[PDB]
Ferritin light chain (Homo sapiens), 696 residues
Amino acid sequence: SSQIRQNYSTDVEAAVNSLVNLYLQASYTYLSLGFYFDRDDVALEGVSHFFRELAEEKREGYERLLKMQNQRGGRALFQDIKKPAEDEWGKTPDAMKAAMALEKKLNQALLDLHALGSARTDPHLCDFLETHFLDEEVKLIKKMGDHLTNLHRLGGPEAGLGEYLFERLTLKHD
Amino acid sequence: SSQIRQNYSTDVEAAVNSLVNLYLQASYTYLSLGFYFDRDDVALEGVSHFFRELAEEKREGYERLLKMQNQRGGRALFQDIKKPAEDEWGKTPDAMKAAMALEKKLNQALLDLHALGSARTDPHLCDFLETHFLDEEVKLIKKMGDHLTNLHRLGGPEAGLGEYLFERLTLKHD
Amino acid sequence: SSQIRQNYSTDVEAAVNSLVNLYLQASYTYLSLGFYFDRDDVALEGVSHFFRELAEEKREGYERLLKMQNQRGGRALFQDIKKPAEDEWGKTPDAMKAAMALEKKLNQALLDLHALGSARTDPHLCDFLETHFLDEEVKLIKKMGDHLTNLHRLGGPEAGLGEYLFERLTLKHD
Amino acid sequence: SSQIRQNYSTDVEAAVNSLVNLYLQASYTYLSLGFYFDRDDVALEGVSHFFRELAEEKREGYERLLKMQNQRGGRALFQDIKKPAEDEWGKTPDAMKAAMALEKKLNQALLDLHALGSARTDPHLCDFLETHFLDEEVKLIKKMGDHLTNLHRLGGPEAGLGEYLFERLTLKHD
Ligand SMILES: [Cs+]
Ligand SMILES: [Cs+]
Ligand SMILES: [Cs+]
Ligand SMILES: [Cs+]
Ligand SMILES: [Cs+]
């Protein structure tokens, strides 16, 4: 391909373009997640920010991947960006569960890419994923599990009451 | 009449005058709300200060209007200010809804004036309302919507406990 | 409850939703333009940054629209995001031209919305578009026009040397 | 094998001693490249420094390897250093192709070593290369690829004018 391409597999190149579309997509759902909680009849500032922060994280990811793509001599190819799975995310636990579900999916794609790069004998690619993606995913998933356990501990009949306290005392305005 | 009056219909003039009386009535009802929640047998500092800040926000309102009336060459014309609708305002949710009604009524009146202003092709009056009133209302009403929602979430058999947690963790005696 | 909604038309709500989609799309294409110029075979850092900044602009653009939608009582309704109309953008003059048309489509969509809100007699929507959008587009299109004029002024047979000077002296790696 | 040597293959050990000779060799070519452009009849300070900087880097390279060699318990075995391939590198585009070709050779040596260490089940060596070498080469090659492209763009006939503008506006005496 380019004058710089060296030991960069045609498969992995296609594989990353795929991952960037996945992250773009992920980002899109968090954006949705974020404004959902900003609705006057949901009003959970704390959780809203939580998701907006995540949307930016996802953005940083695909931008990170796109930068890498250009460094290895690969050519970025864009695709449509599927709209989020839902339009209304019910209550916080529901939002979290979905968010985690999404992250596990994202983590798997990462493990898959790594496995491929490992196969096509791509040490720079594997190193890249481990440095900027693998540990990030593990930590976010742990964090979400913690949130889940906590939200569950605040379950009904004092459901609403617990959802409020969780946004105030854990998610916090900040 | 006045040496400065130009393109200022006598209708918007009487209308602004009517609007300052409205804002005077609103501010007065917010004063009532504030001291009701300062009562020893209600004692919710956070909501009392919430309403007192609103009495200020309305006072700024009619003052800003009287200031404009003069800038255009109109003449102020004060009328009696009716006492607030209620002497007692029940609980936070009740008080908030009352506030919500009051603000929506106020927003309608702002929108009516803006219509009259466009009918009398008065571009200054219209811009004046958009810069210092319309968005202010949109935002205040949006915030009350959030409080109203968050309060309904705290409702139920432990409503009293929720009312306290809201005054502490959201309105905050700050 | 969307008990806050007042004077917000159902058709404008849909139009704003449609506008955010148009902004999500514009952002997307700028994301594409952005990394294209980062390619080792295009290698024009100056223009790459120029477009990456525009994607951020459009991003803040649609995020601003969503924030408003909720403030009015509207509901965000996301759709698929169509991929950029191109995979490669040729040379600077070509890209700039593409961006310009994108900006005009946008400006047009904004003017159309203002027209609708005006018709639906929604002063807040109108003030909002005039405040955060209309002037920004004009200033941006004028800037683009200026670059076009300058790039053209740097036309062949030494257009290659001209394209390098522009990125160095006008866009600047900053 | 000394008191510290552990899981440190004799193959990889010989590999590194060979690699430092390669970096020592690369270093030497850059000194040659660096001073050629310092000639009164070439006079291109910007490129001269770009190469003296690359020599500095290669020095850090082999030094990092020697420092590593001792940490694993291996012994350094030095050899003669082959003189640079050329004595005059012609023009900026000629040198860059040279350096590019040099870096590619080096990056291949790295990837090879990684494969060997990976094969001899040596995790520390692998990690060491990913952390201090692979990504550096990827960045430098992408870098040189941009320079080449920008050089080719400043093509001809004004190769002379374009070669001066590149050394002034891209490489910079700074
Ligand atoms: Cs590794
Ligand atoms: Cs207006
Ligand atoms: Cs304004
Ligand atoms: Cs690693
Ligand atoms: Cs690492």
